[PDB]
Design a protein around this ligand. Structure first.
Ligand SMILES: [Zn+2]
Ligand SMILES: [Zn+2]
Length: 468
């Protein structure tokens, strides 16, 4: 299969901006980027298909360097219960869910008139599990309670089927690890993939791939059912099985076994991101250390002879220190997910160690409470897109389903919005670069993100100029 896209405007690169008028593709790689007429002549000689763009625009497809394909799929399938006015309507909306188990979200007891309970949902004859708006609480029916077998705690009200805090976290864990099957995960991943492709995203860094998600990805790959480039960053629990086969870094046609995903800290919203000084709006806490420097170095030393990348979630400024210390000691150039707060004094270390960073520009829009958490001075550390991209390799992501998956909505954020410093905005060209080649570089994918000769031909076709 050879195709020439002619008579249009093709961006091969956004850093620096380079436009051509013709593109020849064969065996899913770019063969030629240049003159429309030269491209036409090549395809005439070799007997390829001619695609006349008719003045349309082409660009490298988006590369989301950090998301959760399984969770995105679960989220697309969930029953939408936002704005439901009565228990009667809530029950009707839940009944209209397909799954052998019905998952849903977004109810509110104020909008309902009272709290939903186990007894209200016992009219539905399959397992039901329904988040509250906040996602900090869930209600379930008896069938679902029976499947979970949770131990008694102050976070679980068995009579009403309501879970909070810890017991909700444990409920999720049991659902994900015990109850959902490999087939369920294949379906989630396929729903996410369809959604992402329709948005122009052809490659993803898939973070926190657990046992069943991996089993689903190998199956989809050999079934020819993966339609996007999936760079899988596995949970560290999978290292035992990898070491027993000596299976490490491995590139299939779509699925890549690429890395390991770790977490130093939690999030600024929950006040669990690890700060060097206490929270401005809770001076009794500085967040939580989930994995320390020695524990990260231990995983890195296991990743090294398997040729695997290591991606480390660090949100708080002190978490960033822990991640930098770990990379320094292990002499390992890893990547950092989020890097939400970066101090001036940390910049030199990031530059010198060449740490790759995956950042989510839509966090700027969503996290309006940043100044409340950390104060005016530390808010200067937040989402420093322009600064980070000028000192190291940086890529754009959504952390979907946390943020919207639509890249144009995150591009708008990176270009137009800032926490406190308008100097941290990037230009439209830079944002497109970061969401294509930037992401590719951050995911160690050297033949993605551009449409020059030799690059994998992942492109999207647009009616309007993406630079306008
Ligand atoms: Zn994270
Ligand atoms: Zn994440």
């Amino acid at each position: 299969c050879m195709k020439a896209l002619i008579n249009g405007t093709i961006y091969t690169s956004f850093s620096p901006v380079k436009k051509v008028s013709g593109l020849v593709i064969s065996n899913e790689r770019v063969l030629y980027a240049g003159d429309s007429s030269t491209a036409l002549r090549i395809a005439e000689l070799a007997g390829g298909e001619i695609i006349d763009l008719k003045g349309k625009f082409v660009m490298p497809a988006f590369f989301d360097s950090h998301l959760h394909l399984d969770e995105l799929g679960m989220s697309l399938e969930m029953v939408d219960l936002r704005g439901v006015k009565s228990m009667e309507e809530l029950v009707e909306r839940v009944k209209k869910g397909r799954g052998r188990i019905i998952f849903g979200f977004g109810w509110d007891q104020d909008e309902l008139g009272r709290w939903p309970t186990r007894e209200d949902l016992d009219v539905i004859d399959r397992p039901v599990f329904l988040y509250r708006r906040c996602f900090h609480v869930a209600v379930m029916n008896s069938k679902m309670i029976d499947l979970l077998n949770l131990k008694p705690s102050k976070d679980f009200d068995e009579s009403t089927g309501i879970v909070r805090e810890r017991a909700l976290e444990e409920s999720r864990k049991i659902i994900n690890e015990k109850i959902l099957t490999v087939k369920d995960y294949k379906h989630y991943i396929e729903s996410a993939q369809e959604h992402l492709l329709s948005l122009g995203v052809h490659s993803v860094g898939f973070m926190s791939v657990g046992e069943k998600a991996l089993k689903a990805l190998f199956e989809l790959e050999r079934e020819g059912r993966l339609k996007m480039n999936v760079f899988a960053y596995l949970s560290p629990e999978l290292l035992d099985k990898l070491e027993e086969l000596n299976l490490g870094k491995f590139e299939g046609r779509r699925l890549r076994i690429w890395g390991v995903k770790l977490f130093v800290d939690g999030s600024l919203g929950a006040r669990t991101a690890l700060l060097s000084e206490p929270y401005t709006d809770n001076p009794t806490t500085s967040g939580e250390l989930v994995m320390n420097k020695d524990e990260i170095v231990e995983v890195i030393e296991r990743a090294k002879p398997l040729g695997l990348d290591v991606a480390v979630h660090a949100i708080g400024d002190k978490a960033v220190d822990v991640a930098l210390d770990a990379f320094e000691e292990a002499e390992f150039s890893g990547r950092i997910e989020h890097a939400s707060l970066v101090r001036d004094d940390q910049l030199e270390r990031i530059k010198e160690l060449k740490v790759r960073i995956s950042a989510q520009p839509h966090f700027i829009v969503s996290d309006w409470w940043i100044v409340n958490r950390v104060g005016e001075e530390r808010a200067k550390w937040a989402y420093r897109l322009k600064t980070l991209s000028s000192i190291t390799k940086l890529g754009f992501s959504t952390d979907s389903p946390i943020e919207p998956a639509d890249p144009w909505v995150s591009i708008d954020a990176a270009v137009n919005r800032y926490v406190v410093d308008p100097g941290e905005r990037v230009s439209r060209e830079e944002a497109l670069h970061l969401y294509t080649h930037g992401s590719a570089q951050v995911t160690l994918a050297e033949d993605l993100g551009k449409l020059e000769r030799g690059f994998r031909a992942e492109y999207i076709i647009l009616d309007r100029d993406p630079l306008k």
